[PDB]
Amino acid sequence: MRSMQGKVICATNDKTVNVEVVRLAPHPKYKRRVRKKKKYQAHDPDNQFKVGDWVQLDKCRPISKTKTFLAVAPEGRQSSATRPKP
Amino acid sequence: SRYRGPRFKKIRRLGALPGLTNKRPRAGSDLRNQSRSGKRSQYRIRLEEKQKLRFHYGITERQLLKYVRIARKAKGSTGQVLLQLLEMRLDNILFRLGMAPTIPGARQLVNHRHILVNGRIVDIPSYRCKPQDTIMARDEQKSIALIQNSLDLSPREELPKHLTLNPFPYKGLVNQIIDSKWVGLKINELLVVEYYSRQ
Amino acid sequence: PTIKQLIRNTRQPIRNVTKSPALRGCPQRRGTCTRVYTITPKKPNSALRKVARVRLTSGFEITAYIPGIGHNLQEHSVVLVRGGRVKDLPGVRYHIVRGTLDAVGVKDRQQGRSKYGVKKPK
Amino acid sequence: MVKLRLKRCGRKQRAVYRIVAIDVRSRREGRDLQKVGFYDPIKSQTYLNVPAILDFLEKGAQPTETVYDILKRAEVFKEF
Amino acid sequence: GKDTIADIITCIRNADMNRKGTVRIVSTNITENIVKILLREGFIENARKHQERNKYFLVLTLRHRRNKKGPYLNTFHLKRVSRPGLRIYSNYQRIPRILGGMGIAILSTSRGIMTDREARLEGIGGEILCYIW
RNA sequence: GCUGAGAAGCAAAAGGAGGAAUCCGCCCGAGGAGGGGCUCGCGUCUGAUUAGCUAGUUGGUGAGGUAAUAGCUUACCAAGGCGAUGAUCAGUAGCUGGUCCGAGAGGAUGAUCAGCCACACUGGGACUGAGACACGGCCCAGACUCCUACGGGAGGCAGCAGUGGGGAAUUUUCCGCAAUGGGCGAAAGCCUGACGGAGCAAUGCCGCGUGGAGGCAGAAGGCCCACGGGUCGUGAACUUCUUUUCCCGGAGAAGAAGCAAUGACGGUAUCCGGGGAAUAAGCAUCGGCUAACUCUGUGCCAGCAGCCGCGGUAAGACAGAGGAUGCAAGCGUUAUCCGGAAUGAUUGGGCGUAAAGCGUCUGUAGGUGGCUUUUUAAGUCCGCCGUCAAAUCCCAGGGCUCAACCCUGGACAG
RNA sequence: GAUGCCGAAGGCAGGGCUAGUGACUGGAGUGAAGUCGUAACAAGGUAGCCGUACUGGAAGGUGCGGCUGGAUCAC
Ligand SMILES: [Mg+2]
Ligand SMILES: [Mg+2]
Ligand SMILES: [Mg+2]
Ligand SMILES: [Mg+2]
Ligand SMILES: [Mg+2]
Ligand SMILES: [Mg+2]
Ligand SMILES: [Mg+2]
Ligand SMILES: [Mg+2]
Ligand SMILES: [Mg+2]
Ligand SMILES: [Mg+2]
Ligand SMILES: [Mg+2]
Ligand SMILES: [Mg+2]
Ligand SMILES: [Mg+2]
Ligand SMILES: [Mg+2]
Ligand SMILES: [Mg+2]
Ligand SMILES: [Mg+2]
Ligand SMILES: [Mg+2]
Ligand SMILES: [Mg+2]
Ligand SMILES: [Mg+2]
Ligand SMILES: [Mg+2]
Ligand SMILES: [Mg+2]
Ligand SMILES: [Mg+2]
Ligand SMILES: [Mg+2]
Ligand SMILES: [Mg+2]
Ligand SMILES: [Mg+2]
Ligand SMILES: [Mg+2]
Ligand SMILES: [Mg+2]
Ligand SMILES: [Mg+2]
Ligand SMILES: [Mg+2]
Ligand SMILES: [Mg+2]
Ligand SMILES: [Mg+2]
Ligand SMILES: [Mg+2]
Ligand SMILES: [Mg+2]
Ligand SMILES: [Mg+2]
Ligand SMILES: [Mg+2]
Ligand SMILES: [Mg+2]
Ligand SMILES: [Mg+2]
Ligand SMILES: [Mg+2]
Ligand SMILES: [Mg+2]
Ligand SMILES: [Mg+2]
Ligand SMILES: [Mg+2]
Ligand SMILES: [Mg+2]
Ligand SMILES: [Mg+2]
Ligand SMILES: [Mg+2]
Ligand SMILES: [Mg+2]
Ligand SMILES: [Mg+2]
Ligand SMILES: [Mg+2]
Ligand SMILES: [Mg+2]
Ligand SMILES: [Mg+2]
Ligand SMILES: [Mg+2]
Ligand SMILES: [Mg+2]
Ligand SMILES: [Mg+2]
Ligand SMILES: [Mg+2]
Ligand SMILES: [Mg+2]
Ligand SMILES: [Mg+2]
Ligand SMILES: [Mg+2]
Ligand SMILES: [Mg+2]
Ligand SMILES: [Mg+2]
Ligand SMILES: [Mg+2]
Ligand SMILES: [Mg+2]
Ligand SMILES: [Mg+2]
Ligand SMILES: [Mg+2]
Ligand SMILES: [Mg+2]
Ligand SMILES: [Mg+2]
Ligand SMILES: [Mg+2]
Ligand SMILES: [Mg+2]
Ligand SMILES: [Mg+2]
Ligand SMILES: [Mg+2]
Ligand SMILES: [Mg+2]
Ligand SMILES: [Mg+2]
Ligand SMILES: [Mg+2]
Ligand SMILES: [Mg+2]
């Protein structure tokens, strides 16, 4: 399906990262949307990603008792690069 | 499961009920004690309406209820659909065709296997009749004799336009579905529908 | 009131509390009478009411009302109790079904007989 | 293996079968992969949807005697 | 001014209940469009724009008193729906209709703002701004 | 084919039928479908008078292990992981299609029927095998029952019946493999307490009956009565018609599938004849809510009651009688759940005096947040596809004489 | 056959949680009628109430602050 985009809370460990993914859900009864946040152990060979990074999160085989997810380069995001002003 | 009790009696309290009795009530002779309940609670008016219906067709309550559920289901005006359903009963059609004296009579007639609907014997009163249907007497001496005498000796020619009757073999024919104006009684179905809001 | 506050689970129901805890989700229970005696009703209803104490199978001891007119019940009799409340007598939440087990039917009652456990007269 | 057989529906004394493609180890009325035929003795009603039948006979579904001979009467074994 | 839409609505409701024909409201793409629509439905007499100190004001003339101010059979109701707390959306087959259609429902959709009528013609759902009686 | 960079190294078989043709098998690969194993998003009860929990624990390497990925194991290295959006701990609970209720939104529940999980006297092991950590297999320990010639053995109904016991309460130690489904067999066939059927029970839902028509307006009797009469009551008695049901005789299926044969149900369902109104109505209530009223007996007694409350001499509320009313082969009482209850409120309430604004501020998380243009497209919207098993609910036909029930087809929701 | 590792009951020991029970004791609730008093509701016979401290058989009393949900008079 669609992969999950998030930001990194912890880089400290080797070949891994700890991502936080925020999603909104329409709470079952009261029809307002809510932010629920979940954390993941993402496998990141090469340790390219630092803390604060905004990374896309992908699915693969189990690497550990926790990490199922491949850390993957940010998928599509709006350029924080300045644009013309006509 | 049938009302075998005193009839005249129910008639005094309800109103005029064709499917029950042809004998017009006694003067009523209650003019001595002059006993009334005062007037009737709105509830009692509703109740007496339903009872009118129920005893005219010889239906039990638990049955009437299920007719009413079938009614609320049906897409259409509820009281009307109900009155349709009640008026399509085999025994009642057997009655309104003059093939019977009254509804307990017609009912008995059906029970004893004296009637045919499209060349097949139906012995149950509540069999629902559908358009283009043949109402015949079984070909035996008894069946024919019954139908003949009760048909001929009763003069009423009121046949309500959806009902055909044909002379020697005595083929009755159900032509179509009842019209609200052709209904078999004076009843505001509105009151009955209302009574049944709580089921 | 505030949406954000309801989303913290601010609406919780009050559960249904039974009027007859001693039965434990049953139509009847059987018990043995520990005692059979009279009590006076809360004023202004004056009379003498026939109540027994019954020790049940579910282990409880309760005080059950005995209906009708007169009775044969005495201690170490095995009766059948059912629910329902006598608004007169404080604490009495249970009746005793007549005509079953050790309670006989009321003698000579002609009307509403099924409520008292009496045969039809021939 | 996959079997094409009858599952028994309807009521007491009046019995009506569906013809179904189902794994041989599920119960007689248990869950299945595909519903295919319809059968009935008393109304002498019988008919089948053949594209499915053939697509299962092709992947190696084995029929049961009764069914076998139903497919026979309807000439599905010739096309095969 | 946490909600701008609700506020416009309110200024109307208030000026209406007090039997004044004239209201000052603060303009915006939303405001302007809503008022346009209000005019083409016919709930309001006339609109116009004003400007001072880089502020825009739509003044609204309002339907005259009903055959006196004391004896009023009719008022002109307004109700916010989707509001910052809970946003209400509807597909095509849930699109609201008001008092059998006597009143109107405003919708913001992909094709811009409209009434429920337009939404039904074009087959679109969207965010329900408010109802009007 | 498998190991391996390679060099190389290493691995298989089974015959039985038939006179022969040929058949069923056997070994090694490579596919298919079905059946299992794993991994992850989402959804999946109450408790803060449960606040910190976790050290193979969270990750890294090396060696092992598994059918396969994995702290699955082990050694070393690192210090993580989870947690006030409720971790851990305690308490309850099999879950889901569904069922019941609700105008809807949603509440309560998870019998039968169908899917999945888990378990097999209480705990732990493995073995065999494609598949088990195996209900009617093995081993051990324990608890319990039996047999024993005393040295030793045997066993596991939460399989179908059945017995004790607990309990308000839940059935025959039945017939049959004829149908469908399984197992093995070349087939003939054998075995199937799955299943197909019967029996018992108003437990429930649905159908039918207990008569139909006529019946002086005269008589017996009950009850009321200002003694005039009223009412039970066209009700019965009475006269005719009819026979579903009952009784006594006859014939007698489909269900069986393409060679005939083969039916537990069963001589049952149905059909033809002969009698004969003949064989068949009870139960609640009658003070208000709530449809239906009077009289005799009692006297704060005996008793009734869902709530208000009735009952101290004329009780429409007690008990009896007559009468009426409601339902009807059922009618009531109790238990359980939802409703009504807008009484836990999103739709749908409140907080000056009725229950309810912290004593007042500052402020962290969290929620909401002015206007204009552009971008993006996460929500949002529209189209198309996959799926949300069948059964159930809903619509449209069809079959059992009707209905309940069964069968075919199709679909909104979400 | 023996032996190592892991190992279920079994043993001991201290924990946490909960179940039952216990001399006696503290208060709560309902009991027409008993005792003592009469605190509250009228300016309730000393205005009442809130917090708090001290005392009193008991309702209470007084102090210190606050409020009117205080009557009388002031308008
Ligand atoms: Mg019935
Ligand atoms: Mg009666
Ligand atoms: Mg019949
Ligand atoms: Mg209702
Ligand atoms: Mg309730
Ligand atoms: Mg045939
Ligand atoms: Mg939606
Ligand atoms: Mg070799
Ligand atoms: Mg041979
Ligand atoms: Mg040979
Ligand atoms: Mg649940
Ligand atoms: Mg280690
Ligand atoms: Mg459990
Ligand atoms: Mg409701
Ligand atoms: Mg069970
Ligand atoms: Mg099952
Ligand atoms: Mg056991
Ligand atoms: Mg093996
Ligand atoms: Mg297992
Ligand atoms: Mg086994
Ligand atoms: Mg066993
Ligand atoms: Mg058993
Ligand atoms: Mg027993
Ligand atoms: Mg017992
Ligand atoms: Mg047998
Ligand atoms: Mg067989
Ligand atoms: Mg077979
Ligand atoms: Mg075979
Ligand atoms: Mg069976
Ligand atoms: Mg019987
Ligand atoms: Mg029955
Ligand atoms: Mg029976
Ligand atoms: Mg019973
Ligand atoms: Mg039973
Ligand atoms: Mg008669
Ligand atoms: Mg005859
Ligand atoms: Mg044959
Ligand atoms: Mg006959
Ligand atoms: Mg009344
Ligand atoms: Mg009574
Ligand atoms: Mg009740
Ligand atoms: Mg008196
Ligand atoms: Mg006297
Ligand atoms: Mg008297
Ligand atoms: Mg008198
Ligand atoms: Mg009485
Ligand atoms: Mg009586
Ligand atoms: Mg509610
Ligand atoms: Mg609200
Ligand atoms: Mg309120
Ligand atoms: Mg107050
Ligand atoms: Mg207050
Ligand atoms: Mg304040
Ligand atoms: Mg404070
Ligand atoms: Mg602040
Ligand atoms: Mg902030
Ligand atoms: Mg913001
Ligand atoms: Mg804005
Ligand atoms: Mg389905
Ligand atoms: Mg239909
Ligand atoms: Mg039909
Ligand atoms: Mg279907
Ligand atoms: Mg869909
Ligand atoms: Mg005391
Ligand atoms: Mg006393
Ligand atoms: Mg005083
Ligand atoms: Mg004083
Ligand atoms: Mg005072
Ligand atoms: Mg002093
Ligand atoms: Mg002093
Ligand atoms: Mg003072
Ligand atoms: Mg102050």
Domain D1-80 sits in CATH at 3.30.1320.10
The structure tokens 């004391």 sit at E70
Measured between alpha carbons, how far is E22 from E15 in angstroms, rounded to an integer? 7
Instruction: Report the separation in Å between the CA atom of B198 and the middle of ligand 14, taken as the mean of its atom positions.
Output: 14
E102 plus E50 within the same structural domain: no
By CB atoms closer than 10 A (0-12, 13-18, 19+), residue B133 is: middle
C107 CB and strand G closer than 7 A: no
**Given in angstroms, what resolution was this structure solved at?**
3.6
How far, in Å, is the CA of A11 from the C1' of nucleotide F76?
23
Do E4 and E35 belong together in one domain?
Answer: yes
Domain count, chain B: 2
- C-alpha C32/C-alpha C37 separation (Å) is 14
Which protein residue lies nearest to nucleotide F348, measured between its Cα and the C1' atom? C1
* Distance, CA of B12 to CA of A38 (rounded, Å): 78
CA–CA distance, C1 with C3 (Å, rounded to integer): 6
Find all residues with CB under 8 Å of D45, minimum gap 6, and list them.
D38, D39
What does the block give as tokens for E47? 């609109």
Question: Strand F nucleotides below 7 A of a protein CB?
Answer: 32-35, 38-44, 46-47, 57-61, 69-72, 78-83, 85, 106-108, 113-116, 166-169, 179-183, 194-198, 206-215, 226, 229-235, 241-244, 254-258, 265, 271, 281-285, 289-294, 300-312, 319-321, 324-329, 331-338, 344-346, 349-351, 366-383, 389-390, 394-395, 399-403, 405-408, 412-414
Residues of E with CB under 8 A from a CB of A: 85-86, 88
- Where does a domain end: E75, E96, E114? E75
Angle among Cα B9, B15, B20 to the nearest 5 degrees reads 60
Distance of CA E93 to the CA centre of its chain: 23
Same domain as E127, residue E110: yes
HEC assignment per residue over B5-70: CCHHHHHHHHCCCCCCCCCCCCCCCCCCCCCCCCCCCHHHHHHHHHHHHHHHHCCCHHHHHHHHHH
Instruction: Tell me which amino acid residue A58 is.
Output: D
B82 with B92, same domain: the answer is: no
Task: Give Cβ neighbours of residue B29 (< 8 Å, ≥ 6 apart).
Answer: none
Rounded-to-integer distance, Cα B76 and Cα B189, Å: 14
Length of chain B: 199
First to last CA, chain C: 68
Mind giving me the DSSP string for E42-92?
TSSSEEEEEEETTEEEEEEE-PPPSSSSSS-S----EEE-SBTTB--EE-G
Strand A69-72 and strand A33-43: pairing? parallel
Task: Bin E14: left if φ > 0, else alpha if -120 < ψ < 50, else beta.
Answer: alpha
Q: Are residues B114 and B178 in the same domain?
A: yes
Q: What share of chain C is helix, strand, coil (3-state, %, to 5)?
A: 10, 25, 65
Contacts of B147 (CB under 8 A, 6+ apart): B99, B114, B137, B170
Expressed as residue numbers, the domain containing E99 is 76-133
Task: Give the neighbours of chain B: at least 3 Cβ pairs within 8 Å.
Answer: none
Q: In what order do the strands lie in the sheet with B171-174?
A: B115-117, B133-137, B171-174, B163-166
Q: With contact defined as beta carbons under 8 Å apart, do B54 and B103 qualify?
A: no
One domain, residues E57 and E90 = no
What's the CA gap between A70 and A17, in Å, rounded?
10
Amino acid at site D77: F
Q: Do E51 and E25 lie in a common domain?
A: yes
Joined tokens for residue E118: 């337009």
Element spanning D11, H or E = strand D2-11
Please judge whether A31 and E88 are an interchain contact, meaning their C-beta atoms are less than 8 angstroms apart: yes
Torsional sign, CA B143, B148, B153, B157 = positive
**Could you give the dihedral angle defined by the CA atoms of residues B151, B157, B163 and B168, in that order, rounded to the nearest 10 degrees?**
40
Q: Is C78 helix (H, G, I), strand (E, B) or coil?
A: strand
Q: Report the 10 Å Cβ neighbour count for E41.
A: 14
Helices (H) and strands (E) in chain D, counts: 3, 5
Nucleotide nearest C90, from its CA to each C1': G30
Whole-number Å distance between alpha carbons of C96 and C99: 9
Domain membership of residue B156 as a residue range: 87-183
CA-based nearest distance E86→chain A, Å = 5
Instruction: Looking at the structure, tell me whether residues E60 and E99 fall in a common domain.
Output: no
What's domain C1-122's superfamily in CATH?
Answer: Nucleic acid-binding proteins (2.40.50.140)
Provide the b/e sequence for C29-64 (b: ≥16 CB within 10 Å).
bbbbbeebeebeeeeeeeeebbbbbbebeeeeebbb
Would you say E113 and E82 are in contact if contact means Cβ atoms under 8 Å apart? no
CB proximity list for D9: less than 8 A, separation 6 or greater? D15, D16, D17, D18, D29
* C-alpha span between B164 and A46 (Å, rounded): 95
In degrees and rounded to multiples of 5, residue C95 shows phi and psi of -100, 175
Rounded-to-10 torsion of CA E62, E67, E70, E75: -40
SS (H, E, C) A18-80: EEEEEEEEECCCCCCEEEEEEEEEEECHHHCCCCCCEEEEEECCCCCCCCCEEEECCCCCCCC
Interface of A with E in 7-66 (CB under 8 A): 30-32
Displacement of CA A8 from its chain's centroid (Å):
7
Indicate the domain borders of chain A: 1-86
> How do strand D14-23 and strand D2-11 relate by DSSP bridges?
antiparallel
| Tally of structural domains, chain E | 2
Element (H, E) at D5: strand D2-11
Residues E7, E65 share a domain? yes
Q: How many CA atoms are closer than 13 Å to the CA of C53, on its beta-carbon side?
A: 8
Query: What is d(CA C67, CA C70) in angstroms, rounded to the nearest whole number?
Result: 8
Spatial separation of the C-alpha atoms in residues E85 and A34, rounded to whole Å:
11
Nearest chain A residue to E87, by CA = A32
Distance CA(E107)–CA(E104), nearest Å, equals 10
Is the same domain home to B64 and B92?
A: no
Are residue E66 and residue E2 in the same domain, yes or no?
yes
Name the region of C70 (left: φ>0; alpha: ψ -120 to 50; beta: rest): left
Q: Chains touching chain A at 3 or more Cβ pairs under 8 angstroms?
A: C, E
Distance CA B173, CA B152 (A): 17
DSSP state of E111: T
Distance from C-alpha of E77 to C-alpha of E13, rounded to nearest angstrom: 7
Residues E89 and E42 in one domain: no
Structure tokens belonging to residue B87? 């008026």
E29 CA vs G44 C1’ separation (Å): 71
Q: Quote the CA–CA distance of E51 and E95 in Å, as a whole number.
A: 37
Indicate which technique resolved this structure.
cryo-EM
